[PDB]
Amino acid sequence: KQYARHLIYDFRDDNSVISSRLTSFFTDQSAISEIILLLYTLNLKANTQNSHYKILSTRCDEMNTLLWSFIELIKHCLKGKAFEENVLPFVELNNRFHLSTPWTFHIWRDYLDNQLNSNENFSIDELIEGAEFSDVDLTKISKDLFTTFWRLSLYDIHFDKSLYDERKNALSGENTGHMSNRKKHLIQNQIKDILVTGISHQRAFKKTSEFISEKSNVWNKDCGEDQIKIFLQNCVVPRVLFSPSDALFSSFFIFMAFRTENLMSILNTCITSNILKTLLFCCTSSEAGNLGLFFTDVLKKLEKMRLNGDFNDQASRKLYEWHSVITEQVIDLLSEKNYMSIRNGIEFMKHVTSVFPVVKAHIQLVYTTLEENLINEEREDIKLPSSALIGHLKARLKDALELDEFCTLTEEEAEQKRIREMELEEIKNYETACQNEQKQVALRKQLELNKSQRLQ
Amino acid sequence: EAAQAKWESKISSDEIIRQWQTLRFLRSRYLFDFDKVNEKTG
Numbered sequence: 001k002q003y004a005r006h007l008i009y010d011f012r013d014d015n016s017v018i019s020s021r022l023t024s025f026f027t028d029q030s031a032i033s034e035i036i037l038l039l040y041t042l043n044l045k046a047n048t049q050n051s052h053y054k055i056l057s058t059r060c061d062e063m064n065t066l067l068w069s070f071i072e073l074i075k076h077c078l079k080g081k082a083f084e085e086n087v088l089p090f091v092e093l094n095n096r097f098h099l100s101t102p103w104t105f106h107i108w109r110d111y112l113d114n115q116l117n118s119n120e121n122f123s124i125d126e127l128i129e130g131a132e133f134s135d136v137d138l139t140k141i142s143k144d145l146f147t148t149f150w151r152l153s154l155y156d157i158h159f160d161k162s163l164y165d166e167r168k169n170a171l172s173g174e175n176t177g178h179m180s181n182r183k184k185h186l187i188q189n190q191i192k193d194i195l196v197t198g199i200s201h202q203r204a205f206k207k208t209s210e211f212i213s214e215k216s217n218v219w220n221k222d223c224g225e226d227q228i229k230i231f232l233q234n235c236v237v238p239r240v241l242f243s244p245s246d247a248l249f250s251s252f253f254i255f256m257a258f259r260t261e262n263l264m265s266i267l268n269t270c271i272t273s274n275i276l277k278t279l280l281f282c283c284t285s286s287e288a289g290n291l292g293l294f295f296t297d298v299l300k301k302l303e304k305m306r307l308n309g310d311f312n313d314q315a316s317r318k319l320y321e322w323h324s325v326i327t328e329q330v331i332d333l334l335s336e337k338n339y340m341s342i343r344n345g346i347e348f349m350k351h352v353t354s355v356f357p358v359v360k361a362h363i364q365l366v367y368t369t370l371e372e373n374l375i376n377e378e379r380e381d382i383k384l385p386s387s388a389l390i391g392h393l394k395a396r397l398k399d400a401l402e403l404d405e406f407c408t409l410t411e412e413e414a415e416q417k418r419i420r421e422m423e424l425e426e427i428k429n430y431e432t433a434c435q436n437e438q439k440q441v442a443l444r445k446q447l448e449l450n451k452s453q454r455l456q
Numbered sequence: 457e458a459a460q461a462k463w464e465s466k467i468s469s470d471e472i473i474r475q476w477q478t479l480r481f482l483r484s485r486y487l488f489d490f491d492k493v494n495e496k497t498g
Binding site: 047050053056057060100135136137229232233234237238273275277278281282336337338340 | 470474481484485490497
């Protein structure tokens with residue numbers, strides 16, 4: 001963790017003497033829990049003023065980075081009892097005032113995992129301590145999962161062995177010389193610390209992996225589709241829009257808690273009910289990129305279940321049924337209005353096009369719809385990633401692509417495939433040699449005359 | 457609930473930026489429908 005901050009210039013532990021002097025200024029005013037409630041309602045008061053259009057979309061995103069980066073200064077300095085006396089309790093941050101449940105648990109998650117790993121008699125204290133949830137409805141949700149989903153981080157769901165040891169060969173690799181006895185004392189003292197932290201990660205990872213399986217017998221017993229529907233909007237999608245580190249968590253947890261027969265029911269529901277056009281409208285620049293990071297780890301985690309593992313043959317087509325909906329959902333969004341529904345659409349496609357090429361037909365659809373709005377109207381310089389994105393969609397267009405290898409039943413499309421095969425037999429008779437003059441329509445024009453139907 | 461109550465007064469009786477300022481608050485309870493309830497997606 002500390003080495004990753006060293007690469008993105010996140011100097012926290014470097015200046016700990018400077019940052020702890022600054023935090024003491026906010027405590028003598030007795031105003032740490034006054035800044036947080038002020039920076040929150042000023043983010044909601046910006047949904048009341050009307051001065052401009054695009055800047056009020058940025059000022060809503062700028063008061064979100066300022067509130068997130070203020071919490072990270074509180075957690076770094078106020079450690080122990082000082083955190084308890086400054087920050088208000090969890091019971092009346094949801095009752096007197098009204099903060100939201102993504103924001104309420106973000107402050108009070110490090111403290112509720114340090115006390116749970118301190119004593120086991122404190123385990124009965126905090127989970128009884130709960131206030132009224134007026135934001136989301138607890139009438140047919142299971143609190144055995146609603147509290148369980150909001151309590152866990154990515155620290156006890158994912159585990160790796162590779163990146164722990166990729167620093168070990170690299171540190172002793174570059175440091176091979178005679179420079180001091182003190183640094184060789186410290187480089188060895190750095191190697192010993194990865195090893196103790198790796199095995200203590202496995203202690204906490206194993207106690208959580210058995211914890212869900214003792215509860216997974218309960219959850220996959222009452223599968224109401226409306227009970228999945230309450231699970232989807234109230235806890236899953238507010239955690240994905242929040243932060244990139246909390247978007248990966250909602251991807252990993254859904255494959256570890258639920259079973260694969262029920263897992264095909266829930267991810268079908270997010271695809272089938274067309275909400276992806278309405279999601280990408282009401283998001284900012286940052287909140288659209290996190291929803292891309294959630295989908296790029298579902299489709300990557302599904303094609304490890306198709307290539308190595310086995311899907312059923314109708315279930316393999318059910319994978320491609322989701323492929324045909326998502327392109328129709330985004331092309332209707334790629335042609336929409338002045339700035340919002342086009343800025344989110346290109347930002348969504350910058351992450352997901354790692355695993356884009358599954359269908360040969362669908363990439364030429366989204367590639368040509370980039371070329372139509374550069375002819376219709378241009379207000380700002382939106383082209384500067386659009387000039388970049390058109391190449392990386394074209395360079396991966398020709399790698400490996402087939403629809404007919406993975407879809408078997410094509411009632412009209414195979415009968416279309418007999419049509420599109422014979423017309424290519426005539427054009428190579430037309431171009432190299434010549435017997436009969438016959439000029440036909442090229443690929444680009446029959447797409448657009450089909451796409452004007454697909455837009456409408 | 458008042459935000460839907462203004463819709464129940466509007467039917468019985470800029471624009472897009474005010475529309476974006478009412479769908480960012482209705483993504484808590486009434487998220488799953490999102491079809492044509494307040495107005496038309498276009």
